[PDB]
Design an enzyme around this catalytic site. Structure first.
Site, PDB file in Angstrom:
ATOM      1  N   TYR A 109       0.837  -1.187   0.000  1.00  0.00           N
ATOM      2  CA  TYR A 109       0.000   0.000   0.000  1.00  0.00           C
ATOM      3  C   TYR A 109       0.875   1.241   0.000  1.00  0.00           C
ATOM      4  CZ  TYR A 109       1.162   0.716   4.915  1.00  0.00           C
ATOM      5  OH  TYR A 109       1.842   0.933   6.089  1.00  0.00           O
ATOM      6  N   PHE A 119       2.187   9.818   3.199  1.00  0.00           N
ATOM      7  CA  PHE A 119       2.558   9.616   4.595  1.00  0.00           C
ATOM      8  C   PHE A 119       3.087   8.224   4.927  1.00  0.00           C
ATOM      9  CE2 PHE A 119      -2.116   9.002   4.371  1.00  0.00           C
ATOM     10  CZ  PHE A 119      -2.249   7.722   4.877  1.00  0.00           C
ATOM     11  N   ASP A 120       2.822   7.204   4.114  1.00  0.00           N
ATOM     12  CA  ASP A 120       3.440   5.914   4.401  1.00  0.00           C
ATOM     13  C   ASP A 120       3.320   5.015   3.184  1.00  0.00           C
ATOM     14  OD1 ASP A 120       4.933   4.373   6.391  1.00  0.00           O
ATOM     15  OD2 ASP A 120       3.278   2.955   6.351  1.00  0.00           O
ATOM     16  N   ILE A 139      -7.749   0.817  10.407  1.00  0.00           N
ATOM     17  CA  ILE A 139      -8.828   1.790  10.356  1.00  0.00           C
ATOM     18  C   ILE A 139     -10.038   1.190   9.636  1.00  0.00           C
ATOM     19  CG2 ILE A 139      -7.297   3.794  10.520  1.00  0.00           C
ATOM     20  CD1 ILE A 139      -7.324   4.021   7.512  1.00  0.00           C
ATOM     21  N   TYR A 165      -8.594   8.199  11.016  1.00  0.00           N
ATOM     22  CA  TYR A 165      -8.133   8.567  12.348  1.00  0.00           C
ATOM     23  C   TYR A 165      -8.971   9.675  12.964  1.00  0.00           C
ATOM     24  CZ  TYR A 165      -4.271   5.465  11.515  1.00  0.00           C
ATOM     25  OH  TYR A 165      -3.520   4.338  11.268  1.00  0.00           O
ATOM     26  N   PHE A 182      -5.566   5.802  -0.135  1.00  0.00           N
ATOM     27  CA  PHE A 182      -4.657   4.664  -0.191  1.00  0.00           C
ATOM     28  C   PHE A 182      -4.781   3.964  -1.531  1.00  0.00           C
ATOM     29  CE2 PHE A 182      -3.070   3.917   4.165  1.00  0.00           C
ATOM     30  CZ  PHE A 182      -3.963   4.662   4.935  1.00  0.00           C
TER      31      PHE A 182
HETATM   32  O1  LIG Z   1       0.752   1.352  11.085  1.00  0.00           O
HETATM   33  C1  LIG Z   1       0.586   0.149  11.268  1.00  0.00           C
HETATM   34  N1  LIG Z   1      -0.445  -0.335  11.992  1.00  0.00           N
HETATM   35  C2  LIG Z   1      -1.468   0.545  12.557  1.00  0.00           C
HETATM   36  C3  LIG Z   1      -2.790   0.439  11.780  1.00  0.00           C
HETATM   37  O2  LIG Z   1      -2.714   1.147  10.487  1.00  0.00           O
HETATM   38  C4  LIG Z   1      -3.788   1.310   9.722  1.00  0.00           C
HETATM   39  O3  LIG Z   1      -4.882   0.969  10.069  1.00  0.00           O
HETATM   40  C5  LIG Z   1      -3.461   1.988   8.398  1.00  0.00           C
HETATM   41  C6  LIG Z   1      -4.083   1.115   7.282  1.00  0.00           C
HETATM   42  C7  LIG Z   1      -3.346  -0.227   7.175  1.00  0.00           C
HETATM   43  C8  LIG Z   1      -1.857  -0.017   6.811  1.00  0.00           C
HETATM   44  C9  LIG Z   1      -1.116   1.041   7.637  1.00  0.00           C
HETATM   45  N2  LIG Z   1      -1.996   2.113   8.208  1.00  0.00           N
HETATM   46  S1  LIG Z   1      -1.424   3.725   7.965  1.00  0.00           S
HETATM   47  O4  LIG Z   1      -2.697   4.608   7.918  1.00  0.00           O
HETATM   48  O5  LIG Z   1      -0.448   3.723   6.742  1.00  0.00           O
HETATM   49  C10 LIG Z   1      -0.548   3.895   9.566  1.00  0.00           C
HETATM   50  C11 LIG Z   1       0.383   5.065   9.474  1.00  0.00           C
HETATM   51  C12 LIG Z   1      -0.077   6.336   9.766  1.00  0.00           C
HETATM   52  C13 LIG Z   1       0.806   7.409   9.682  1.00  0.00           C
HETATM   53  C14 LIG Z   1       2.130   7.202   9.311  1.00  0.00           C
HETATM   54  C15 LIG Z   1       2.586   5.924   9.038  1.00  0.00           C
HETATM   55  C16 LIG Z   1       1.702   4.866   9.114  1.00  0.00           C
HETATM   56  C17 LIG Z   1       1.560  -0.869  10.773  1.00  0.00           C
HETATM   57  C18 LIG Z   1       1.939  -2.001  11.510  1.00  0.00           C
HETATM   58  C19 LIG Z   1       2.851  -2.884  10.956  1.00  0.00           C
HETATM   59  C20 LIG Z   1       3.360  -2.608   9.697  1.00  0.00           C
HETATM   60  N3  LIG Z   1       2.990  -1.537   8.995  1.00  0.00           N
HETATM   61  C21 LIG Z   1       2.110  -0.674   9.515  1.00  0.00           C
END
Ligand SMILES: O=C(NCCOC(=O)[C@@H]1CCCCN1S(=O)(=O)Cc1ccccc1)c1cccnc1
Ligand SMILES: [Ca+2]
Length: 189
Positions: A109, A119-120, A139, A165, A182
């Site tokens: 993603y 952002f990621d 989320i 969020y 995303f």
């Molecule tokens: O973040 C992680 N787990 C928390 C839950 O995340 C989410 O629900 C969303 C959607 C699914 C993919 C990631 N995210 S995000 O929006 O990209 C999170 C984020 C926000 C701001 C800056 C950086 C990353 C996580 C764990 C292990 C490996 N990789 C990520």
């Protein structure tokens, strides 16, 4: 003068190109495609709603500085808005197994704010991300939005803040009340 600045948007982010007005747009299309790791044949570039041919130049097309070119990756495009307000669009329809609630799915993603700031991305870490679909570990927009994807598919999710969020935002990079975009590629279910 001799050169022109053109914005290219793919619906997720926007980057600029400066080229000579007499240079064929093929180089821009190639530089855009090579940047996104995509084949030239897989992309369609549209200007004023009309598809650009690689032999055409900005002068041919009477382009102005800061005009916008749209790069599309899909077959008629369709953006679905569900009962929750989630929006999704299948950029690539997969042909393998279907992801359903309860399965552990593995994806790559990239996430951007709606202003185009990334952002990621799991691709940046060279590491696929897996979660239990419908498991409440991500989320809400992801637990809803990834369902129905098939392996090999790429789906763009546009997530309103109440499915992301929320009013709070997250950490340093997700602002309060942020809509999130995303692109999710389903690798395995
Ligand atoms: O973040 C992680 N787990 C928390 C839950 O995340 C989410 O629900 C969303 C959607 C699914 C993919 C990631 N995210 S995000 O929006 O990209 C999170 C984020 C926000 C701001 C800056 C950086 C990353 C996580 C764990 C292990 C490996 N990789 C990520
Ligand atoms: Ca991993």
């Amino acid at each position: 003068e001799t050169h022109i600045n053109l914005k290219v948007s793919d619906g997720s982010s926007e980057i600029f190109f400066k080229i000579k007005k007499t240079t064929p747009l093929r180089r821009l299309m190639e530089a855009f495609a090579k940047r996104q790791g995509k084949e030239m044949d897989s992309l369609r570039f549209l200007y004023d709603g009309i598809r650009i041919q690689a032999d055409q130049t900005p002068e041919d097309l009477d382009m102005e500085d800061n005009d916008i070119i749209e790069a599309h990756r899909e077959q008629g495009s369709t953006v679905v808005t569900t009962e929750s307000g989630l929006k999704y669009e299948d950029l690539t329809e997969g042909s393998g197994a279907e992801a359903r609630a309860g399965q552990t799915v593995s994806v790559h993603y990239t996430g951007w704010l709606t202003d185009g700031q990334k952002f990621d991305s799991s691709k940046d870490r060279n590491d696929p991300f897996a979660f239990v679909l419908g498991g409440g570990m991500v989320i809400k927009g992801w637990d809803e939005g990834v369902q129905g994807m098939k392996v090999g598919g790429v789906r763009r999710l546009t997530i309103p803040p109440q499915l992301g969020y929320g009013a709070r935002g997250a950490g340093g990079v997700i602002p309060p009340n942020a809509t999130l975009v995303f692109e999710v590629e389903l690798l395995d279910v």
